[PDB]
Amino acid sequence: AKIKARDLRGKKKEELLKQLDDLKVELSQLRVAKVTGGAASKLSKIRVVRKSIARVLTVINQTQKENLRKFYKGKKYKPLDLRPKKTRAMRRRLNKHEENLKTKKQQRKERLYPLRKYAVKA
Template sequence: MAILRSRDIREMDVEEIQKKLDELKAEYAKNISKSSAAGVYENPGKIKELKRTIARVLTIMNEKQKET
């Protein structure tokens, strides 16, 4: 999954943002379960970036919902 920038997320509508959020959460869960099964983080930078992107998406989604 490519990194989503704030301006890219702001250009999407709420349905697209929700769909992207579901994809990010699924990828995050997959990476966490894979790393916990192995006992060693395979790529901690990817996990950190996924967490930040999820937070960014949630923040922008909340902003859009407050506008309406």
């Protein structure tokens, strides 16, 4: 009955939340058994259920985040965790369009006097 994210990524959020909260019920029971002595089998399934909980919460957060990205796709103002992250200085620097902007004088110079290609024979 071991759960995998490739099988988790097709469910709907009602059964995903159901799976999540039965896992949390089982983790609570396992900690009760841990205090009351229980058994080494239960103490070893503690880590299994915890990693399963981490798996389920990863899948839910990832689905919700990609739905948010799809909704904000093509919008003018996106939230601060949906705009890119790269580096503060790289965010401060110019974008390619206003980098490649040029003046009419300088592009007129470029049209009038292009740098030629040439060799000098000996």
